[PDB]
């Protein structure tokens, strides 16, 4: 009767998602030599889990990562953009 919510390229490419990550990802995340490795890993996973929950509350963190892997493998439009970001850096 109702199509299942699914992590499509459209949601990822929306303002919330990859654009949000590129906007503010280095400022919030911070790996410090003084702090232990566990704390830095916790901080990184803390940022990414919050972003995923804001974007895709449906799936847990590990499931979100696996779905992201599959989508990146499949979707061509996602590949287009992923190549594009790298291309801009080569330009820079």
């Amino acid at each position: 009767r109702r199509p299942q919510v699914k992590l499509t390229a459209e949601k990822l490419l929306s303002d919330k998602g990859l654009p949000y990550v590129l906007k503010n990802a280095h400022k919030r995340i911070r790996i410090s030599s003084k702090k232990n490795s566990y704390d830095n890993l916790s901080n990184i996973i803390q940022f990414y889990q919050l972003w995923a929950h804001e974007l895709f509350p449906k799936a847990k963190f590990k499931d979100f990562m696996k779905i992201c892997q599959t989508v990146g493998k499949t979707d061509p439009v996602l590949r287009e953009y992923r190549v594009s970001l790298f291309r801009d850096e080569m330009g820079m």
């Binding site: 109702r2 919510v5 895709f56 509350p57 449906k58």
Partner: protein, 148 residues
């Protein structure tokens, strides 16, 4: 957004029409006219009436819930349910637009810190010895008291 009754913090009560006012302006007062538990029949249901009698039982003040507040552990959204009967069925799944667009099966959990309560008392009123007809026993009428 939220039900209107939730924000209300006042209680509205009606004062009957005194006999002096009714006679002053050429009218008959039905509400103020005292009655007895015997005369309160089914025809008076849904009206404002006065009853004269002696209280024979009172209960301890208890909180009667009027608006229940729930919290979704996923959305962060609160769901308010009005209760206007002697019994109600608690909500289980979130109905927020967030749980709808994402179709997440978030669970609602009751939170008594945000609900609305009103003091409740149940009493009994009985007829005086001057109102019981010969050969009849006194009757009792339940009274519900809410608010202040």
């Amino acid at each position: 957004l939220f039900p209107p009754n939730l924000t209300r913090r006042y209680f509205l009560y009606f004062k009957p029409l005194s006999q002096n006012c009714a006679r002053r302006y050429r009218k008959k007062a039905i509400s103020s006219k005292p009655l007895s538990v015997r005369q309160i029949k089914g025809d008076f249901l849904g009206q404002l009436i006065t009853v004269r009698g002696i209280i024979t039982r009172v209960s301890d003040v208890k909180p009667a819930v009027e608006v229940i507040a729930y919290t979704c552990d996923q959305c962060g959204y609160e769901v308010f349910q009005e209760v206007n009967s002697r019994t109600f069925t608690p909500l289980s799944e979130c109905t927020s637009e967030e749980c709808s667009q994402n179709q997440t099966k978030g669970q609602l959990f009751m939170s008594t810190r945000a609900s609305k309560f009103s003091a409740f008392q149940e009493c009994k009123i009985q007829e005086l010895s001057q109102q019981v007809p010969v050969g009849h026993i006194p009757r009792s009428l339940n009274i519900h008291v809410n608010g202040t």
